[PDB]
């Protein structure tokens, strides 16, 4: 078959514009996040219980963009935020951190796969990015890895706030 590769991802930075509780649904928020493109994608977010309103508003977020997009409890999220988690007696979620000083739409890569073409749109037959999770993990230094390699930008190597050894997920 196909190479199963990360650079087969469209990752990028992304900027949390707006963050709105979910209409239909107690645990999703609605966002609008710059990804570098005309207009911000929104996004739906499973983090309500995990992660208070204000400190997503205008936050700097990683966003997995080639996703097939799908309507979560009524409304369309076009990408999903990765995260970094583990679940112990209670989920622990915590949103993936782009480098410091990094801007809407910087391609976030694995190190060695930044020149690969990422697939037009991720068939879920496929399972590409489930594959691809297999490998996925936050070292001791709590740095998001495939395969034990830094996913990173040009400013730097993508990271979470203290899920070490934790998994990469989307929720």
């Given at each position: 078959?196909?190479?199963?590769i ?14 709105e509780?979910?209409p239909?649904?107690?645990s999703?928020?609605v ?7 005309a207009?911000p ?8 219980q995990?992660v ?6 205008d936050?700097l ?7 097939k ?12 935020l ?5 679940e ?5 979620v ?11 739409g ?7 796969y930044?020149?690969?073409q990422?697939?037009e749109?991720?068939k879920?037959?496929?399972k ?7 490998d ?12 034990q390699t830094?996913?990173?930008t040009?400013?730097?190597s993508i ?13």
């Amino acid at each position: 078959p196909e190479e199963v590769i990360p650079s087969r991802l469209d990752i990028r930075v992304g900027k949390i514009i707006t963050v709105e509780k979910h209409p239909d649904a107690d645990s999703l928020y609605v966002e609008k996040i710059d990804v570098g493109e005309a207009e911000p994608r929104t996004v739906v977010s499973g983090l309500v219980q995990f992660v208070p309103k204000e400190e997503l508003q205008d936050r700097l977020v990683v966003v997995l963009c080639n996703l097939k997009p799908q309507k979560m409890r009524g409304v369309e999220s076009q990408g999903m935020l990765l995260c970094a988690s583990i679940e112990g007696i209670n989920r622990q979620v915590e949103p993936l951190d782009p480098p410091a000083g990094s801007a809407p739409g910087e391609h976030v890569f694995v190190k060695g796969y930044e020149k690969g073409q990422p697939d037009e749109e991720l068939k879920p037959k496929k399972k590409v990015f489930e594959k691809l999770q297999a490998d996925f993990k936050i070292s001791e230094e709590c740095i998001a890895q495939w395969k034990q390699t830094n996913f990173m930008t040009k400013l730097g190597s993508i990271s979470c706030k203290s899920l070490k050894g934790g998994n990469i997920s989307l929720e």
